[PDB]
Amino acid sequence: LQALLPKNSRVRFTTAEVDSAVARISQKIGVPASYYQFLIPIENFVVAGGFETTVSGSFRGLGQFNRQTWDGLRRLGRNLPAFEEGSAQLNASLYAIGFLYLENKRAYEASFKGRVFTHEIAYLYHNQGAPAAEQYLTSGRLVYPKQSEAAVAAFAAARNQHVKESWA
């Protein structure tokens, strides 16, 4: 039973086709497959036989990208289709998730020298955007606070991981 959040069109992908595409793309672009396995179930509906993803409104597809974030990657030179087309596609959305991870990793490492970009930190960056993610890490307040309980839990873990020097 999916929890109702206060805030029509979906696409369904099978687990196997997601897994196959993740394995291929993650290897190609140098992003851990485990990051995709972490992110996809948080952002999308896990249903019998795979995942369903909303492709209407501001946030779309497996990565739940908005157009501005998607277009940012294109501006960097990433070969993606237009937001509205690619966000409804398996491969393009998986490339975008990974390209964004790579960009956010650079942003995190530039602001916090010597620290490790963990999966939960990467998800914070993915969801809030790098500027707002850095703001949450430093201030403890979300710029865009209307997120799911699972997301908020991930962000709290991310900040814990960020501040603490080691596992403990």
Residue numbers in the entry: 48 to 54, 60 to 220
Manuscript text:
P5ΔV8 adopts a lysozyme superfamily fold consisting of an N-terminal lobe (NTL) and a C-terminal lobe (CTL) connected by a central helix. However, in LTs, there is only one acidic residue, typically a glutamic acid, in the vicinity of the substrate cleavage site.
The G2238T mutation corresponds to a V207F amino-acid substitution in the gene for the lysin protein P5, which locally degrades the cell wall, either to provide access to the inner bacterial membrane during infection or to release virus progeny by cell lysis. To understand the molecular basis of the thermostabilization of P5 by the V207F mutation we determined the crystal structures of P5ΔV8wt and P5ΔV8V207F at 1.4 Å resolution (we could not obtain crystals of P5wt or P5V207F). The larger phenylalanine side chain in P5ΔV8V207F neatly fills the cavity, with no significant changes in the protein. By filling an unoccupied hydrophobic cavity, the V207F substitution increases the buried hydrophobic surface area in the protein. This provides a likely explanation for the increased thermostability of the mutant, because the hydrophobic surface area that is buried within a folded protein contributes directly to its free energy of stabilization. Similarly, the melting temperatures of P5wt and P5V207F determined by DSC were 52.6°C and 58.3°C, respectively. The V207F mutation did not affect the structure of the P5 active site, allowing the mutant enzyme to fully maintain its functional role as a lysin, which is essential in the viral lifecycle.
